[PDB]
Amino acid sequence: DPFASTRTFNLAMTDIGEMYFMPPLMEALAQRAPHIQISTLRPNAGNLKEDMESGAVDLALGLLPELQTGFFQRRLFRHRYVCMFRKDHPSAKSPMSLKQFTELEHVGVVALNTGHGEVDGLLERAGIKRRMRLVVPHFIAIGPILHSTDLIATVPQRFAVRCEVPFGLTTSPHPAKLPDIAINLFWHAKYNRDPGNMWLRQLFVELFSEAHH
Amino acid sequence: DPFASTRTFNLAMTDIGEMYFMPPLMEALAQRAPHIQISTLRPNAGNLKEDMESGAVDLALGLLPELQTGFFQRRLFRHRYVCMFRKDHPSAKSPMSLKQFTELEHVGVVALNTGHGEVDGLLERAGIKRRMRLVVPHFIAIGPILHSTDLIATVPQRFAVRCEVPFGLTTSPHPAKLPDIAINLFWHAKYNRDPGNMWLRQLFVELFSEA
Ligand SMILES: O=C(O)c1ccccc1O
Ligand SMILES: O=C(O)c1ccccc1O
Ligand SMILES: O=C(O)c1ccccc1O
Ligand SMILES: O=C(O)c1ccccc1O
Prior knowledge:
The first copy, chain A, has 213 residues and is of the alpha/beta class. Chain A has seven helices and ten strands. The two termini of chain A are 34 Å apart. Chain A binds chain B through residues 15, 18-19, 22-23, 26-27, 37-42, 44-45, 105, 107, 110, 112, 132-138, 140-141, 143-145, 147-149, 151, 162, 166-167, and chain B through 15, 18-19, 22-23, 26-27, 29-30, 34, 36-42, 45, 132-138, 140-141, 143-145, 147-149, 151, 162, 166-167. Chain A: GO terms for molecular function: DNA binding; DNA-binding transcription factor activity. Chain A: This is LysR-type regulatory protein.
């Protein structure tokens, strides 16, 4: 049944999603359905809405404003933005003050087709105009960049904690008031009742849902 | 007038390019041109050739055979593909044999609009069939994924070497016959004499060219 499938599922997610969702998913699949193949793609890859409609993309994961309307969507968890910097930073402290946040230099991330791109506008509207020497499209490059510079960054908490040891970095709670990050699972009405889709949806829900309350 | 420039330069490069190029560039810029901004994008974002022509993208860095004719270029350095897997993998050995390579499960990297996209085809044509359990679009997530699974991957060596300690990975010379990876810097002829472009190109050559 589930054990036997050799179906390939295609999943849209960010690079954080790849490092976060893939290892436990692979571990679960080796226990439960060891022949299933998984392919990922970034939320910006083509025509996400069209590709979910046609069935080329089975599921989408993340903070995804594109799909806020015509799609089924289930919340997996919430987490916050934190500030991150190298463990031996010459001046950065935790907790970091707004003043210090505005004094330091930043690397920014433009996560295309995600809601993370609201961050710069939200800070700007609060009067926090960062000295941002570098802007990159995506998140994982942030680890090595912070490891070998005095830059700081604003990043999702669940990504940050995964960088602390590998890249020798520390986090601070974020001095600015930023909304919570809702990481959701999305699917198109067409596959609402497809057995294989429901099974993979249920697995994501089981593996990744916040113990709510 | 480098020190006073507030120019934003738009650079096309991979996730590997960002981790490798950006920290020394960041350090040089703080010292020579602290008001310059650098914005990156992937080689696959929009269409590279037109954007370099328009000055939408100033410079491209990486393995980019589509720019190999009709663009200016300088070689920065060369390196090879290697096989990478977690240090305590139950069976994977270094050096890995081609037989073992064909037996183990892989994480593939599709790698669009770079030369790395060709790996699947050189292997497939040579008759080296891989059991591809997981496919991702880009390289940089391979580090965390190998660390926490039993998969193996084929990856650029200079990238692989930066993963070894952070993620507890080992490498092997690659059992298959694969081409060298030439990492070049490219620009369009139109900006050949643009002063800010010349200045930044020359900074990349200074910091990264082994030639
Ligand atoms: O921002 C995301 O896409 C994300 C994905 C998985 C886990 C945490 C995250 O912030
Ligand atoms: O349609 C499938 O191949 C399938 C896959 C996983 C679980 C249940 C299924 O029917
Ligand atoms: O593949 C790349 O684009 C690359 C870039 C910088 C250093 C090593 C690399 O392989
Ligand atoms: O001439 C410019 O516009 C310029 C900009 C940045 C760095 C060096 C430069 O000459």
